[PDB]
């Protein structure tokens with residue numbers, strides 16, 4: 001009751017901090033145990049965190065998204081954000097936010113890729129894996145039922161919840177495509193995996209990127225038109 | 235020199251155990267450190283393990299694949315196989331082996347899904363995530379260059395290496411499709427993600443599964459024809 005109240009509230013820094021504290025109190029409750037029953041319970045509580053992250057991304061409150069990793073205790077943080085996921089979470093959040101907002105139509109803009117260290121994380125193949133692992137976790141937290149009671153991805157938006165999740169998960173999939181096909185975008189096999197995208201989605205992406213490359217670093221620009229050209233061919 | 239010698243050898247239990255020991259000695263060398271430079275080095279060494287796993291799968295030596303997790307020290311094992319990945323590795327190996335062999339054409343057969351606990355791991359959404367995370371790691375270990383010197387996925391098979399990796403990674407992708415679209419196979423969006431599959435691949439899958447459902451548990455059978463029907467529609 002105390003929990004379901006919070007999750008249903010409008011998304012603020014207050015409602016976010018209290019919720020994470022509750023999950024952690026619940027998450028902690030499994031750390032003394034080390035069996036298999038403990039791991040599955042912990043694994044669900046873990047993606048309850050990512051639900052809250054995915055909510056913030058889809059609600060255009062990215063500053064709240066970064067705050068999630070802060071409210072999480074270090075031992076819990078080591079298990080929820082394993083290894084290199086910890087180091088690239090800042091970049092993953094930005095990447096997921098950028099794409100999701102585009103898919104929701106948000107008339108731009110988004111910070112540089114070479115400034116927020118996102119373009120840097122791309123050039124490391126092991127950082128792309130840790131980013132991809134996070135994007136995947138973002139996606140599954142809103143597809144699966146992480147709570148024992150149904151919760152809308154965006155508060156108050158019940159009747160359109162199935163539509164929102166569909167939209168968000170597609171965005172999180174295209175963000176996953178950018179990662180896995182870095183510098184191999186225009187290759188035939190890479191383009192075949194753009195078949196999932198709606199035709200309107202591609203146009204929204206082509207436009208938002210074409211408008212996003214203006215004045216940017218050449219490296220980011222060439223990265224973008226590799227993406228755009230891959231969109232224009234699918 | 236000592237390393238590259240081993241990896242190039244024919245795949246046996248002897249050559250596999252020594253290699254894992256070398257990676258671990260190298261992997262250990264980063265555990266005392268906890269910086270960011272340590273994490274990337276460790277993250278690469280980690281997917282060197284999965285390269286060896288992916289080699290065993292593609293070489294139809296699945297018993298060697300399971301042995302990998304055994305030769306890995308528990309502290310190293312906690313970081314390479316995080317959380318629930320540890321518990322479902324046995325299932326992931328089998329799933330990856332089953333599909334890869336099919337893609338390589340191997341005229342069957344493969345153990346039950348309800349016997350090896352694979353069908354059981356499916357019914358848990360958090361186990362599917364841990365399996366998907368492993369399948370993804372299997373795939374990226376052979377796409378990326380995990381060693382500082384080029385190594386063929388299958389020893390002696392140099393000129394056909396790009397072809398093998400292409401084949402294996404597609405299999406590991408279809409194994410990834412089975413996981414993420416469990417009990418939602420025939421849905422339109424799930425079918426659109428079968429576009430990557432070659433037409434011959436689909437037929438090989440349809441046939442190998444049609445022959446795999448004979449006499450099986452009803453649950454596995456209904457799971458299979460959901461897969462087959464999703465293949466027959468794409």
Ligand code: EMC
Pocket residue numbers: 040041358359360361
């Ligand atoms: C709560 C068992 Hg996956």
Ligand code: EMC
Pocket residue numbers: 042043044045046047048050079080137
């Ligand atoms: C730790 C993500 Hg369920």
Ligand code: EMC
Pocket residue numbers: 124125126127274275
């Ligand atoms: C070896 C730095 Hg990613």
Ligand code: EMC
Pocket residue numbers: 276277278279280281282284313314371
């Ligand atoms: C721990 C997989 Hg590079």
